[model samples]
Target chain A: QQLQTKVSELETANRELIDKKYKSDSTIRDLKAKMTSLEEECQRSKQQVLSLRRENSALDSECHEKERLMNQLQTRVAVLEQEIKDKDQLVLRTKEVLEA
Target chain B: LQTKVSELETANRELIDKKYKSDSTIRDLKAKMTSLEEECQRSKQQVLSLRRENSALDSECHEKERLMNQLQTRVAVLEQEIKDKDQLVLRTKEVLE
Candidate 1:
């Protein structure tokens, strides 16, 4: 009788563990799903960084060309402004000579 | 009387044997449950750590996108400046003559 009771008690406890095991299994599934979603986003972020590096380099080159053009234009502006100044002085001198 | 005694001895031997089997069965079942419990605990810890890592990843992702936005704005501003310079040069051409 005592042995039967012991067996019965163990049976009950084992059933509880089985029930808990299934619940834990479900929890694992949930964790698995969450891991994939987060992990995928993390990998995508790495890709984004790589692609951004490429785009930034391209932008730098484009900006460099623009800077070159601007530099040339600035030099041209200075020469043109000097010419305008010289032309104004010549016109003033001509006026004085003609009037005199 | 001798036959009755022999039958009692046989019954007693069978009872003890069955009891031993049941005790072993119970012991194995308990061990199995303990192993499963340990597995569950280990798995739980792993999940917790991964969740922490995932949160950090999210923040890094957000920061990276923010950086990209700033870079985009920088590029846009540079393009606008270049356009202005082109127009300045074009108008400055008239002054040269």
Candidate 2:
């Protein structure tokens, strides 16, 4: 009777342990899944960020070029406006006076 | 009695080993998730700060063209997406705990 009782008790504890392990395994599995998803998302977003950064740099270069070109354009406009008002200018021949 | 004892011992050890391995794996996964979140936040900040500079320029140069509004809108969109991902990470943390 005593040995049988010990056997039964150990068996019951073993069953409970099995149940607990099963639950833990499930939790671990879920956790792994979540982690993988996060990693995947991170990779995807990171790629986007790299692309975005590249685009931004490209924009920066274009803005810089626009600045240089706009400066030249404004300089040309200033020269044209001056020529329109000038009378004894060096670059303007007297024949070119009142030039349209 | 001997047969039951041997079988129970074997079963108990198997359960213990499985449980330990699972816990170790969980810990590793959690650590990796933390690192990934940090990386995400850093990149998010990068995106935001770049947009911020552009957004300001957009305003200061709101001349014949309102480029700032479009870029400001893009900034807002990126901000919202980054924020949304942060919330998702928060929920995941709660679940992990």
Candidate 3:
């Protein structure tokens, strides 16, 4: 009877051990999955940073181009104003010549 | 029997401890994930703001370009008008001579 009790007790302990091991394994697996997901998220964030940097560089170039174009337009406007002033002087000279 | 019970209890305690450690690691990972998500959100917001700014810049550029073209066309027209007036003045001088 004592031998039978020992066997039954051992079997119960073995079952408990199996249950504990299964629970621990499940927890480990869950943690590993979470870690993997976090790693993937970090990688995505890194990619976004790279993309934003590229966009910023492009915008800088575009802004420079626009500034250069605006400067060119301002120079052209100045030249046109001078031409118009010279033309006005010529018109006045022609009128004076006719009157004389 | 007492020895067997003690051994079983020790194994159970080890399993519980391992589970606790795993839980802690998972919590830390979750916190990291939340922070990363927030960063991503901020990046998206920045991109949106930049897009709006770019649109405004584009519109202003277009308006300036239009004005420049109009001024160029008006200058050309004025030049043509001046040429015609000069021709009229020369013809009047020939009549006087």
Name the candidate that leads on DockQ: 3
- Give the better candidate number (2 or 3) by DockQ: 3
Worst 10 residues of 2 chain A by lDDT: A83-92
How should the candidates be ordered by TM-score, best one leading? 2, 3, 1
| Residues A1-100 of candidate 1: C-alpha lDDT, one tens digit per residue | 2234544554565556556556655555655565565556555655555555555556556555655655565565556556555655755675687699
Per-residue lDDT of candidate 2, residues A1-100 (tens digit): 4466767788888899888887887888888788788778778777877777776676666666656655665565555445434522432453365485
Q: Can you rank all candidates by lDDT, best first? A: 3, 2, 1
Score each candidate by Cα lDDT: 0.56, 0.68, 0.69
Model 2 lDDT tens row, B11-59: 8888888778888888887887789889877877877777776665554
DockQ, each predicted model:
0.03, 0.13, 0.25
On lDDT, the stronger of 1 and 3 is: 3
Expressed as tens digits, the lDDT of each residue in A2-72 for candidate 3 is 44465467567667766866876676687668667766766776676667667666766766676676677
Model 1 steric clash pairs: none
Best by lDDT: 3
- Score residue A28 of candidate 1 by CA lDDT: 53
Off by over 4 Å in 3: A1-28, A31-35, B1-3, B64-68, B71-97
For residues B1-97, write the lDDT of model 3, one tens digit per residue: 4566566667666766766776686677667667767866776676676666667666766776676677667667666766776686678668877
Overall local distance difference test of candidate 1: 0.56
